[PDB]
Write a protein that binds this ligand. Sequence first.
Ligand SMILES: [Zn+2]
Ligand SMILES: [Zn+2]
Ligand SMILES: [Zn+2]
Lengths: 41, 221, 95, 79, 144, 101, 100, 103, 881, 122
Amino acid sequence: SYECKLCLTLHNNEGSYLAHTQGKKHQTNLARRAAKEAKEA
Amino acid sequence: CRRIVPGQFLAVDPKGRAVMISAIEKQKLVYILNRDAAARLTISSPLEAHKANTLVYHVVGVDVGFENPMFACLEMDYEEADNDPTGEAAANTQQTLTFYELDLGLNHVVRKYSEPLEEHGNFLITVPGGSDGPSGVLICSENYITYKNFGDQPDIRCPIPRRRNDLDDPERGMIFVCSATHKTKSMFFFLAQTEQGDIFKITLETDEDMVTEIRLKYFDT
Amino acid sequence: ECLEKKVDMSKVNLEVIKPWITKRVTEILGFEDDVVIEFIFNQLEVKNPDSKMMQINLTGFLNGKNAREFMGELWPLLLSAQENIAGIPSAFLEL
Amino acid sequence: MTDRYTIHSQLEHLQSKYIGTGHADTTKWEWLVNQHRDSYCSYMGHFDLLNYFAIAENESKARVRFNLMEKMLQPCGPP
Amino acid sequence: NRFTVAELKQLVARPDVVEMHDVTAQDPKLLVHLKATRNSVPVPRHWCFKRKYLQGKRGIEKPPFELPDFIKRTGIQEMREALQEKEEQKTMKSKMREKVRPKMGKIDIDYQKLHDAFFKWQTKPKLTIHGDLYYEGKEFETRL
Amino acid sequence: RLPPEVNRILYIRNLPYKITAEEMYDIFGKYGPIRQIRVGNTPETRGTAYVVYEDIFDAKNACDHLSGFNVCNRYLVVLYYNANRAFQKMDTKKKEEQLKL
Amino acid sequence: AKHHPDLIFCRKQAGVAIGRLCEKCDGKCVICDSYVRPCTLVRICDECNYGSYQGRCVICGGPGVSDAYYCKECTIQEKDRDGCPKIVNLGSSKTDLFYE
Amino acid sequence: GGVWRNTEDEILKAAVMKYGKNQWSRIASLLHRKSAKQCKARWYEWLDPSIKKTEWSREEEEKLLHLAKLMPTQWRTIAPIIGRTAAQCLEHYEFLLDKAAQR
Amino acid sequence: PLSDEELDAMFPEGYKVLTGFHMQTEDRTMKSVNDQPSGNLPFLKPDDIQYFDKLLVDVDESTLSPEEQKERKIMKLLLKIKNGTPPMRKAALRQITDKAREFGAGPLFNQILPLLMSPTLEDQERHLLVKVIDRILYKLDDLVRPYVHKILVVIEPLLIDEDYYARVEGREIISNLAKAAGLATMISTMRPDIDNMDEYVRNTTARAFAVVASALGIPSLLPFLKAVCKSKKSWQARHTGIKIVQQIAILMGCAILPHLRSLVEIIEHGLVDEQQKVRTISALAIAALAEAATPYGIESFDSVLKPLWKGIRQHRGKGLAAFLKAIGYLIPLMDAEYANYYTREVMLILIREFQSPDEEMKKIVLKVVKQCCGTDGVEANYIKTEILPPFFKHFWQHRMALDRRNYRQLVDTTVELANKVGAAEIISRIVDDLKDEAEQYRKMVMETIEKIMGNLGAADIDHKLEEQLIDGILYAFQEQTTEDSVMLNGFGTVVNALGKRVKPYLPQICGTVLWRLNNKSAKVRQQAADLISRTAVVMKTCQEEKLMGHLGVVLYEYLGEEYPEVLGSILGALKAIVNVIGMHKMTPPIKDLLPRLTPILKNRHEKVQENCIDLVGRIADRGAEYVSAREWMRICFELLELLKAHKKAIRRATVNTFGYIAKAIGPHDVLATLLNNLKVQERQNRVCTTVAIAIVAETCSPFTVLPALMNEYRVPELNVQNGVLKSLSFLFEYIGEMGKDYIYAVTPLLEDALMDRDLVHRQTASAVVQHMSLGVYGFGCEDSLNHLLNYVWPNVFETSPHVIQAVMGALEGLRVAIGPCRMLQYCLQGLFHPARKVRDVYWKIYNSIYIGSQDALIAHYPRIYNDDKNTYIRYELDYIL
Amino acid sequence: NPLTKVKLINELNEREVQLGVADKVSWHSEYKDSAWIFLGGLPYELTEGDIICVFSQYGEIVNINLVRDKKTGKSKGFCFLCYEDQRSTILAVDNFNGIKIKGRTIRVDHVSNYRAPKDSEE
RNA sequence: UUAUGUAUUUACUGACCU
Ligand SMILES: [Zn+2]
Ligand SMILES: [Zn+2]
Ligand SMILES: [Zn+2]
């Protein structure tokens, strides 16, 4: 089974994963972890 | 050795037609024994005599000569004894002699008679009846022996003979431990036994078909 | 509460008690039945009856007010007749 | 009179008619009194625990059975 | 009505078990008596959590399974991996062709080696006593 | 002939909002005598009506030959209402013999 | 059974009448509901064996063929020493399928 | 029925990314409900990356309201002319704008 | 006829009273109004737009919105249940049961009840609606108190309904309504439906009282029956109450017995009443009670025999018929003197009433003859002189074969007359009518003969009569129209009774069958093949194997059929021949019989599959030397597609054939097949190859399957891992006490399975722990189980129902293995825990321990010290010698 | 009970037409040799002539027999009819069974013996 | 970032089922 690893979310099949690329934007809430990565832009 | 399922107390009809196996609480069973044409023993389905919240101290076969079989048992109902925190409600909760009559015509067990007791009896003794004797149940108890039989017999009390001045009693009662009925083809007697070993010869001497008075004597030790 | 001082129907008559109860239930629900008057009969057949079960099964037909006042009427008549060796309550001893 | 204590039984989910089982809201006193009653019927049930208890006093076996039997009504004390 | 962990911890002969919820019981003294009775095992750690006992095992990837050694010394792992790897190359053409014309004797290992591995070479595993209940980490705390 | 068809009633659905009072009297006294009508108040029920007659055959005339009849420009559908309920069981009526018959 | 969780057992006192299973359910255990190791006959109560209901299947209520049994795993758990295992109600299966 | 939920839309996007344009049986071979006709129908009707599936302009609306008067039906002839081109996005525009020109 | 007061009492609120020519149309004002509502939901039929009318408009939930749309979101739910796809059905149905306490009984029942009270329902819609009602009766306990009567006036005609399952639905929900509404609500509710004028509601209220009497016991309402039956203002009340007594007797059969006496003393206040209806139903109630008692309570009926005797002497009409049913049911309960006396002076009335025209009295005397000749009294020559000749004169007609309750009663009485008189006396009176031209009448005569000759035997039939019945059953077998088996089973039972005396009829029969097996292909070829399967038994025990070898080879090539139901009976016949001959001595030998059966095995019809693998199973264990041993391999790829077969007898026979194929060719080729089968996505196809893995395990011992089955837990797929755990479940369940050797090999597997995140892993490993726990009991393996208990025990809090019942079965299976002491040690310090969520689960684990072993816990309880008022120390255990 | 016999004699013909029983053995071959039929449940307003008018549709009834009571009554409720031909009785028991005249539903069956003055089912 | 309520697929369970 398939897992969004930053998301920590499980997925039964393939189209359950690659339709989880749009909701719950931790995908851009890694801007906080990028601000911890670098204190500027 | 559970509390609810039967097996502790076992009574049988003296003619040999039923048998009751009973627990110390809540549930009793009656099998109906017969014989079929190979002279072979057969057993019916177990009849039920369930009665909730009920202790049973002893059970015994009441002799009734080719009548509906009856079983006598010393019961005690304790639900008001455990509902009342005052403590005195469980102090005045005397036993009941109860008679279960098996309607062979209707194939079930009914509580026929239920009479309280002014002391706590511990075990019962069958009296032979039908044609042989005054059909009933003796009731042994602390410092007493009592013939009770339902319907018309007044309750006959006989206080148990203590010894002369035996030095074991500050305050202690005296019970029986054995029954040992005997049927000598003229009369019938009972070799009862107190807890020290003092066998008594209890004889029922009845002027009517009703009992009149009971009497006993120090047989041996 | 007051319905728990026990009764023994061997101590009481019943054929003198029925017309009062018929008259009361004709007062209570207005008209006449039989099956509730025969409820009174058949519930009071048993020698040591129960008053709480009586009150439930009359609360069903009647209001739950009228069952309450009916038990508070009917149970002291049973006690006032079972005290007496005659078996008759005070409303029918005096009248 | 009475009020609103109409609770005759309900959905027969498991029928725990085995007395002594107990449920979630079972107090200390209730399961200890079931524990004492099961202990007493197992004492007089087995012959040999009744032997062991009769040796400790000098009381005979019917004395011990009558004592154990009359204690099964209220063994722990009043509620 | 609910006397707190101070007094309840003062009363009990073993105060080392009374917790922050035992005050909120419906009978505290027997609860911390049975909590301090001798050989009991406690309630699992996840009765109060929010995570349904193992839904915290999300993103960690773990090895498949270590076979015990007496099974691995039969060669069944190597034969089985070999024919799985050979079967991963087959198309449906040959998977349906060798369904009706089957080559057999693919494994045919022996019966005496397997009998010896379960009967001569049986290994007692590493068990545990009855107290050692399982919680969620429990094998990543191998630091003891 | 026809018992199992409930009559003296006629459910009317998809009826215009411009019905002031008169047009239901028109269409439903056109076929025979009327008992009355029911006009809704909820904007659901506004636009959906009942009509009750004193005659069975007039309700048959209505429902046999007004099905999908187009009117002021929304065609209505007719059915037979189902009487199933009440709200108050009427009581203490006398309705004595009184020597009328 | 264990599969249909809404089926209720009779659970009254087991008489002398030996239980029977239909032809569709021969070999099934009654409680654990499996096929292997039958060890103990089924005794059913007299109300669930009366008149029209004699020799009828314990589970299906179809016409019985062979005798019914408990597993060894029901026996040694003493799941045979409770009431009679005659499944009473027919609920939510083989009813809607009849309506389908 | 042709319901076309998301877990087949995204697999169709992956399949058209892999296989191609005039090759539809080979990508209906992995969808368990759909035929190749329905795959063509969706990937040109909804999933085509040229479809500007939002952003109603003002030039195209004044275009279509006297383009759907030239040829009054026929929203597959005037769909490539408008270029909104989903041929029902045009019908959405035309019925929405004749609701808003009525109200 | 109406007035305006009844009129606005009738209608709901939200309402107020108050040639030709051509031109054109124009573009409209968009006459496109909604007729079906706003969603996907279902389609609405034109009759459902009163009940679901409020859904065609959108609420937009505000400004028309109290909580009431929440209590008419149930309108959407009833529409989704009544007319929807089954996912929508179970979705809406689970939703309405989970919120049934939230919606309340008011809105929910006053929408459900007028929907059922529509004249345009359907049996499946009635089924789904009564499903909705009984599913909301578990949740609305003690809340249907106003709504009992409004449920009953809908539900009650389910009791008198035609189809049986609708009657069972009626009885079950009135029993649930009885246990939910208590008792006083019932007596309050259904009393005014006694005196009511309509006999439909009066009969149906009587049956409703009977079913609530069964659900709540007789003596709760026995004063009510005693009340309503002695009421004397209108006879309809007495008729109704005695009808109640009748249906209580016919509902709960022998559980009326301990209340019988106090129940029969009601009924004898009837039988003397002035209405013939009341006396008639009092006799019918006595007949139901006497049917129900059987054979008990005869001295409880002794107050009834004198009015029954006076009634049968003085009356004539239907009161005589009810009295006659009553005495016919009584006299088997009676001792032999009084029974023989009442028999010998009721036979005169029965001979007087064989002339009777009415059909119900024909049914009643046809029942009375069954019981009044079974006892001891009526001797044989009396019966065969004048009981049976007018019997066969007046009852063996054609119309009594048509009516099914007159069909089966007549044949079941004719069998009893054959029990008393003899075999050939009845048979020789009806054997000539196996040659009749009514199919139902030949069916009746054949069922009569098969029951007689199965009960008694065939020794009484001479050689002047067995040819009569042989030609009778041959003519009857040749000319049947229907697909019934009754004449097939009749043929089989007859020839099994004749035994070896059928020897000069086997040429006639086998000639008739072999010619009979061509016949236009007109489906009387499964009659010929079924007849071969039925008479295959009698030819071995009659020293005939030449003609067995003759029709074995004929059935070898009638198996190339295109009709499936022909070929299924062919395979059934060939199966019966393979049994009745040896396998290794049969004329189409198994070397070239099984290869004909391997392409038959790819035929997806259920009958052909079923018979084919029964035959392949017998060949695969008893004849495995007739192959290539390549051939068994290329059919054990056929037995995987021979799963997924919707009959469960196929699926449990094919796993046996895997076991036998394995014992032939070894468990390393069949098992790689069954392990490639474990990745399919389909149950019915993975659980039944898991079972086959356990079969190939236990036949050819594990250590032949268990290394590879232990290996394939390492394959990273969900299905194969749950498959090897489920196969360990079935394996330990099958092998039992051989689990003493393999428990250390699978404990490191089950610790990983119970340690795993997914809960299906944990439920399957818990089932394995259970079966292993019961298989190693008493062998000293209580250390491994106490290890695995530490991993089972945290699964206690799971609320998925399958995994909670799997772990709770595992705990009550570990009770006996490691002890009640160890399980009681784990139950303690959590029975009293503050959360109820943990407390109730540990109390039901403790209840399973307590009822599982109550006495063994006595040593194992903790010590609990004394508080202020109570003594909690069991002192008797504590003191010493 | 008084008119479930209507349902039973109707279920006879419905089960024959269901099973397809030929007319040689279609139950009327037992009530051969009898042109008599028992009526049942007539209204008491029915004279002899009105019964002849309704049941003469399949042939003029030769011998009618109402059960007029002895002195105090006028009609009890039966009638027996004897037609010309027995097939008229077949037609009448098929066609006139379960029709209803002025309220009450009537029934027809064969007789096969004689004019029995009172035995049959009131 | 644990989490809800729901619209809602997809997977999975019970040797479920003619
Ligand atoms: Zn089992
Ligand atoms: Zn039962
Ligand atoms: Zn079955």
